[PDB]
Amino acid sequence: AKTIPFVASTALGERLFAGVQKVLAAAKAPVSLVQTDAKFAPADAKYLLAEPLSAAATGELANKYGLSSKVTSGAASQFYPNSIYPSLNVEVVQNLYALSNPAFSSTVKDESAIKLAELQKETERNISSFFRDEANKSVQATLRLACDKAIKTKADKKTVMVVTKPHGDAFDDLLAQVTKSESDGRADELRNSSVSVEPTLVGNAWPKLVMFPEGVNVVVCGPNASGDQVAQLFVGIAGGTGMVAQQLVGDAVVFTSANAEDNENPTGALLAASNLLTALGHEAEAKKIAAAVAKAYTTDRILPKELPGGKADLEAFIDAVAKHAS
Amino acid sequence: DAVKFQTLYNVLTGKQHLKDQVPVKDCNLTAIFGASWKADLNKWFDSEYAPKLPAAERDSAKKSLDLYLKRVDLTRYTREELTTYGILACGPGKVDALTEKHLLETGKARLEELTAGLGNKDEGVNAFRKEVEQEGKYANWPAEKSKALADKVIAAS
Amino acid sequence: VSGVAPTIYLRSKAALPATSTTDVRPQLYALQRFAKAQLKTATEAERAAIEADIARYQEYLDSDLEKLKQDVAEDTAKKQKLIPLLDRYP
Amino acid sequence: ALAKASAAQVDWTSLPAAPPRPSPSAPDTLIRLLGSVVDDLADADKVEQKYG
Amino acid sequence: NVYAPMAEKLALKSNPELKVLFKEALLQPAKLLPLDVDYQCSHDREVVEAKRD
Amino acid sequence: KFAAMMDILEEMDARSGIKPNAESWGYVLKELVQAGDFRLGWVCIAGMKSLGITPDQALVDANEANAAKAKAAGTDFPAYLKKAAPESFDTKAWGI
Q: Is C75 on the interface with A (CB under 8 A)?
């Protein structure tokens, strides 16, 4: 039985440990969960599961495990009651260089002081060039992942990618530069699969995402306040905090579930566990878990308290899910 | 009439983009239109668009129209209020209760701010009423509704 | 400004997030990655010194910056003892 | 032809001309509070009025 | 003398009036800005709201 | 409000040959008093005496009052002129 660690700083994660453990034991999978902390997690562990991370904790974990991007997945909108967005087969991708490095924003002609200024300028040149190369590499990683995702997705002859780009700050400038570079550079998988990439503004992008997310397949956002806002918008539109399954990739894959302070819906974390099991190979067990979730939401309809419609407790909901699985 | 409603149906269903770098919004659409949006839209649908095509596509068209109407009703709110102050984080069904909660809470906070800055509870309440009435008048919002809201916040304080 | 607006534009300075917090752990990770990048162009002795530095940073990471803060306190104590001795004419 | 011309005459797909904006004439109090920042904010206001 | 400009800036900022204006601006910033003209010309209230924010 | 009046005065002096009077420059100076522009005010005060016209001290004192107010208030010039320039030459830094 493998030992996949499981970071949980809060009582919510501490109880969801036992919850997901009961679920997994009823699902009969040959793996196990090891309670750890975000600051003492063990390296050389590629596939992981986790809980709602704070911003600083996401930055720390990304710097630890070499992460570059965060993906979302709103599959639970089909299960949401009175669903305004059934079968929301799109994906949002957000870069992470702000959380990984918040400080990225930042004499009479004697033969001595000018030399000192030259050396200081060389030092700052080296530093800023390294940081700029790292940011450019993270942005290239995000964009390459989004392109590979748009290509891997079942193309409806449209394959649309929206990219938020409020003109201004250095992050947006870099993002414009790398989008231009990739587009004018590769263009071949893009033009062959007919992947229509479009940089747009926030005020012109998020209403499109709201009204018609059918016209879009992939969304890309930098680590600005605007990108965080669009990500939280999608995280809510997928069924509220708790229902969407978040993911974090780079040099290693970890799964998460978004949740505010007062929320307790673990369906995002259950979908995260299912995605993890599909990644490792236990697709039958992931399908069992998904069928159990669907049975909980449709046959018994035992919805959690925070959600509209029916109302029930976290632990009773997890008991229903486990009994449905087994 | 029929022309503008067909343009509206095309914009809602997404078969057409609007004739500039402009977004679709309740404000940015009802401003063009005559402020009889939903009633005349549904009436024109049921009159001239439903009986033409078969019931099979008619059901899905009515469905999609209700979805897009709800989505524009959600679009009415601002992005910052939606995300940061937590109007949407629970969900569409809870947008209304969360808006009411945020409104009452921010009203109580503004009232406490005015009383801490000025004291003189009568003066503070008067200034709060003036501010609320002016913001309602600027947001095209009923003055009776604003006065009732202000009295409600004062009672709940 | 068409449409009956649902909510009023009300804001409180308390509701406005004013944290301005300051992180050290990600800065140390960035330093470690920069040193790792610099290690490739290093000579033998410089490579050994940078390896010792990387080991020191890893020790800070495992100690959760406690040894780092201890060294900071040591240096600050050295400076604080250094200042009043140089006041030749207090 | 009259009906066709009347329907063609108006651009429902387009956006109407908003009322014009007179000069700002910023106040001395706000300027004393924010000397150097109102220029950046006005530039951002132009940027948002054009794009957003 | 780099600190003499800073001393002048200190003499400028160190006033009671500027703090009174801050005290009455943050509590009632609607007075300063031309909000009726902004809401009149502006087609999206999100612009005016982000302007005040 | 000033440019229309001084275009009427250009239409007066240049086009039609008529020349303004103390009443005309009085209406001109009242506008600059209301607008608070003390520099254009001082221009009008100087132009009067260069043409023999004499201002009203009720307006001269209001001009000097606006001048003293903007002096003490720092509004003697706009703020965008009283801020440092880019030490490094850059087409974006200078704002063009």
A: no
